[PDB]
Amino acid sequence: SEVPQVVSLDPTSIPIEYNTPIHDIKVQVYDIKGGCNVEEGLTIFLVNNPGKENGPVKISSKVNDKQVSEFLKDENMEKFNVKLGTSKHFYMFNDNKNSVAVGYVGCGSVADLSEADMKRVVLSLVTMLHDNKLSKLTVVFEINVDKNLFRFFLETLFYEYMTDERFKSTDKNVNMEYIKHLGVYINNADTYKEEVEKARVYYFGTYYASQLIAAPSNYCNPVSLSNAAVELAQKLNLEYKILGVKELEELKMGAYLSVGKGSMYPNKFIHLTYKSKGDVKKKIALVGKGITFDSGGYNLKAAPGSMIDLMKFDMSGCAAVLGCAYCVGTLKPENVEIHFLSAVCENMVSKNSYRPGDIITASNGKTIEVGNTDAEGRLTLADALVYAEKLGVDYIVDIATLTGAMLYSLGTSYAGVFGNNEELINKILQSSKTSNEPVWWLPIINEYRATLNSKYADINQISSSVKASSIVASLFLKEFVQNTAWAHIDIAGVSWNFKARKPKGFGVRLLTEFVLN
Amino acid sequence: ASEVPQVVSLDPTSIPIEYNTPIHDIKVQVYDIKGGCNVEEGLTIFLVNNPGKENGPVKISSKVNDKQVSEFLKDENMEKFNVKLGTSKHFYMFNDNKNSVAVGYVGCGSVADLSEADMKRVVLSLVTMLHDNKLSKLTVVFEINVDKNLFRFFLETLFYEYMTDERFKSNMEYIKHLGVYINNADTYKEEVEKARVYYFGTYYASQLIAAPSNYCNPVSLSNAAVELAQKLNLEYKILGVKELEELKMGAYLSVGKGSMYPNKFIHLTYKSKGDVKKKIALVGKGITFDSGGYNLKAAPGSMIDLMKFDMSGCAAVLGCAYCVGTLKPENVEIHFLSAVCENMVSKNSYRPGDIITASNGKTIEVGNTDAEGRLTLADALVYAEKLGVDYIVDIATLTGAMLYSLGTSYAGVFGNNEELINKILQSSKTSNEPVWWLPIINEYRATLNSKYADINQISSSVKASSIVASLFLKEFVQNTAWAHIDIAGVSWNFKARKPKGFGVRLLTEFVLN
Amino acid sequence: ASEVPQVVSLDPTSIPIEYNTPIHDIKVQVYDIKGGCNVEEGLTIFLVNNPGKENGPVKISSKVNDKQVSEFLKDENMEKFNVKLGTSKHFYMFNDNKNSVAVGYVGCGSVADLSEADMKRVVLSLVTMLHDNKLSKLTVVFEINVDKNLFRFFLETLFYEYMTDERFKSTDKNVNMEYIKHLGVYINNADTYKEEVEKARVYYFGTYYASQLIAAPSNYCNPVSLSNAAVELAQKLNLEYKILGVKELEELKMGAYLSVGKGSMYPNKFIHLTYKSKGDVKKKIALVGKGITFDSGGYNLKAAPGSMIDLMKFDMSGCAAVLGCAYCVGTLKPENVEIHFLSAVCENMVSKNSYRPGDIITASNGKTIEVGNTDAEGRLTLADALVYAEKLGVDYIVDIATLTGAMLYSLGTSYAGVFGNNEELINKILQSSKTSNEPVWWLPIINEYRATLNSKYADINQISSSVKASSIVASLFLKEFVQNTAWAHIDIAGVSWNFKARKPKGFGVRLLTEFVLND
């Protein structure tokens, strides 16, 4: 629990915001058939025009105000169009002779919006929220969205609206004011009301993950991260267990322990557990890669394009699992038992570091020839997977920033899923659809297995020949699951939002939807 | 035929092609294994596995009609050997009639069902024995389980790997007979002559790919296509620069500008005798050498000495033309297309930054002259859609990034129509040429928005270049089902230093079934 | 024996060493061909060639004491097979006693004088016949002309290549691992070749022992665990031994060697083994091996493409060769000679405690050295070892080291390079290269390059500025630490590791031993 320091100025904990401004927003949902009351703050209409590309804007909703209705006549709205992402502000007086702000956001010509489309809309909406001190936002849905897309709108709204200022000091935004009320007008609102607080849960789980990832490696280290996981578990009444080095040694986790050797921080294996009250139908282990900083070790990330300064993100997998733990522990699903696992450590350069060429022994007794110390993720998951299987679960799903090759195969939008079981894979893909976090199925090609044959050890860590890293890595991991349905989600490409310079918190909602449904 | 230009009189003016191979002279018999085996001639090899027992002992179950070989095959002798996938042994001995025979086995592992990767290992081990064999007959006994497709794969692979390409050259002899013992022999007999056709289609494509760029150029390759068309009685047409200019194929012609060889657009057509119920266009990338242009392949690992293989897509299509023109399917009309050129460095070459206009009217800003494949394909695809076909399938050594996604075994397929993709995937299964469905991610499309042209050729940032390329090609197919097979990673067999002729059997199964 | 420091309790604390190998269980019998060949159980392989006629037909000229086998192996039956170098075939037949026997041949080409490289091709073919076949015996019939040395080389290579290192296998041990118990050899003038058999078995293990050390990863083979293994070897051979630690190294003022090791968690250990004859000593020799148990490069980290930092466990190959030579010498026990076996062992790591590029360090002979590259550490450790060596007062100093990557561009992977300050000694190394069949080539120490080692602040630069001819410059540097003693330097950076087979060669063991013995 005691975070070691080099100097007294070194942080001893991760700053974490639980009570966010988003949580102080009173969210009300009304049915659109009763007409919209425009009284205060900003009222935004979500409007589209099916068929006609860049077609005119029309407000079909009934507006419980004479003046505002007249303003929003088709004659006045004709000049503006519905191009996806477009937004305009309006200013007028209502029946009460009060000034009020109104606007709209263009949702395009398609009848149904995709994942990227809805995010575009939310991002336009957020630009209306920034640099404008408002106390209330009202959103009127004049497009068709199902419950999962509606929930996604809210989660995305909350996430993008929220600004992380934990590490700001002399440069806090002096104009940072959040709305206190959120009104939503939608058709058949009763069915959507339950999606509100689910979205706020999904929002924080994601933002919590984001907070851990964005936290630099001097704040977020194996000790502080495991201390944080404990605190979360305590707040959620989850059972928790943190495995220290001596316990890890008894479990003979040589692959995991070797990776952490060069670090000033002791390895910490995180093990949280949720169990439903009553009969457990499904037991699930979620495994997240928890490298708090990845320098590459003696295979130092020195080559152009290696992006060593991003490598605080190499615990994004762990963060996803902890975010999921928040969501699951909050929403309390029935008939499941969930283990949240992460072999957390740091990959550093030291006199004590493991070397290229070292042969190390995993907890399942397999000897491993280390070909590249910067392929340290699969080493820690190997021992984590053996641990997961010993729990006697039905499903093991690991999530990890494992291979840079994902940027060349799927890019920055879709994560890859590999596995040994088609049913689990389809459950993952299904959860991908309902969580609106895109995943694509990639193959474990067995012809490459021979390239992991070692002359001296039981198996090679990395291949040579084969340059298909994501597949070879999946081949390696498969060797540490003997007979359990297993899947592997490589989020190396999608975890960090390069354009926005922040984490996505990718995987929290995906893993939660998998566990819940 | 066109006169291929020369720099010096020693420059070759055609691609040497072998049509009649020793493989075609092999007489193939298929016997049912239930009746026991005859072993009086040549080389006999047993395909053996041991389920459950990894690297377990060899055990031969078949009864053989020779006492001398029966003693050799007894369990106490054979258990000295093991069934590790690819492991083989063979011994020479006299049989009952005092004739010299050779007897052995190839291990097939401990898994009862072989993948095509496993089967290729087995065949390779077999071929190695054949390359040191002078006997006239090989007999293969399947003490394993294979379905009709995998058995046809076994024969195709055997024929292909057995054959050695000696065209450019200035201990063994080819067998005259092949015997097969296998359960339910009658139902496999129809796969033999299909395997012999698939073999040559694959091997012919292989000859074109392996043909160096001084032998195989746009003129000589198009000449060969014509000669293939003439032998198969296919309709054919070669479009030269003048008619390509009139068709306004600015993208295609821009790539060729810097070459001493004029661009040649290959168009072969197979039309069935009966009514036509499906029209297909098959499009193959045909770069006879890819230097990279002014974006020269100079970086470490760019493997410029390999780039004679950049017309592998074209070879696959032409090899498919052979199989289709030979097997003569019904109710179908197939167009075999290839915009052939050479990508070179010259005073006349297209430049990075040049804005060029495709035949469909779109202007393209060239960001990288080494992304030349998609430019040629763009005009090819515009040509194909004007034919009014139900399906357009293109196949191309398009993006090196395939090595980082699927690697050297699996090709990637992208497309705009789920039905066509599933048909490709189904064809991958029955042809045993592995292919994986990859996505065309629409969120990346914005990276192709040019400041000045209608569209960018490449992205500046995206990194997912195989998908970005697919998005580029997609822009030139307006309302036809279209799929794109990227064979950049799978075309060349790096370990064996030769082509695979990948795609011939895949495409043929697609049009046949 | 020192205690090996651990970071975690799962860190290994010794090198696993296999002394009693299955090769040592093989009984070898040598017969004269004049008596005829008996063919029974196991595998009987004829080594045949056909002079002049490339890929000519196989002919078996040896007498075979079996009518059935003789009939099978008659000219008319063999002419369908050819003698292409490396070709092999298996035969099956019943002999005069109605027992089934296995026979065959390995083609030895169309040249009567087989080179050491072509002989390795023959042995590898023969080994492929041994693998995946549970045999109790192998018989070899030499129908080619080989001298005593090449015959011994055949046996050494057979033993070495047949052997399979499974020390680090856990779940992936080969279940079908079974070795012959008997080896028969038929050859003309057999009584003259018999003396080579045990010599070959000794040379095999000396070579195989070195290979085990080299192949051992750096978490197993570190300076403490390696010096410990040297102690154990000396104890089994009754060699004198002394392991010098940091304290005594400091007293001896070995600043160059010590600075290399500063960055490691493992303390420096200087190995000193000694063999002395019971007879009057007539010549004294020191053998010096480079002993970097892992070479990360230091602050000049190996991060450049093609630097193969994952191979860097090999960087104690020189030390391994010397220790392998110690085994052979302590076993064969040469007379009238005193041999010192030396290695300044350490690990070149990156650390707050590491030595830095630009550092100026003082060697044990008082020479100050300016460090231009932390990855040029071998010659620093050797500098102090060479000074130490000459203080012993010996006749010859020979060092062996994986020193410079440039060797791959000069001699490649087959020939080692030898440099020196004495012609007579160099000729003897070249002579031992011939009689051991470990290829070495004489390379010059070009004095004109010496000026590029002129330091502005120190007495001498570690590395050159101009040059690029690293192997020669490094030799120039080393020469500065040998005042008045015959000295030779064997660079084995190119030949140490077998890249195709992914294993060490144990190169240098036989070479050094032949050098010790043949004088």
Ligand SMILES: CC(C)(C)C(=O)N[C@@H](C(=O)NO)c1ccc(-c2ccsc2)cc1
């Ligand atoms: C360096 C290589 C090819 C071995 C690799 O795949 N590295 C992983 C890694 O360091 N795993 O521990 C890697 C490299 C880069 C990234 C990455 C992802 C988004 S930007 C950089 C992610 C993983």
Ligand SMILES: CC(C)(C)C(=O)N[C@@H](C(=O)NO)c1ccc(-c2ccsc2)cc1
């Ligand atoms: C260099 C880049 C990213 C533009 C690319 O994908 N180039 C293609 C190409 O030259 N298309 O015309 C490319 C690069 C390398 C290969 C390749 C495949 C196996 S080895 C090299 C294949 C295609």
Ligand SMILES: CC(C)(C)C(=O)N[C@@H](C(=O)NO)c1ccc(-c2ccsc2)cc1
């Ligand atoms: C790079 C240079 C010139 C300093 C050099 O010779 N380096 C040595 C070395 O690191 N000595 O400590 C070196 C580099 C590479 C090799 C090598 C040999 C086979 S693969 C790499 C061997 C020695």
Ligand SMILES: [Zn+2]
């Ligand atoms: Zn890494």
Ligand SMILES: [Zn+2]
């Ligand atoms: Zn990592």
Ligand SMILES: [Zn+2]
């Ligand atoms: Zn190109």
Ligand SMILES: [Zn+2]
């Ligand atoms: Zn190309």
Ligand SMILES: [Zn+2]
């Ligand atoms: Zn070095």
Ligand SMILES: [Zn+2]
């Ligand atoms: Zn070194």
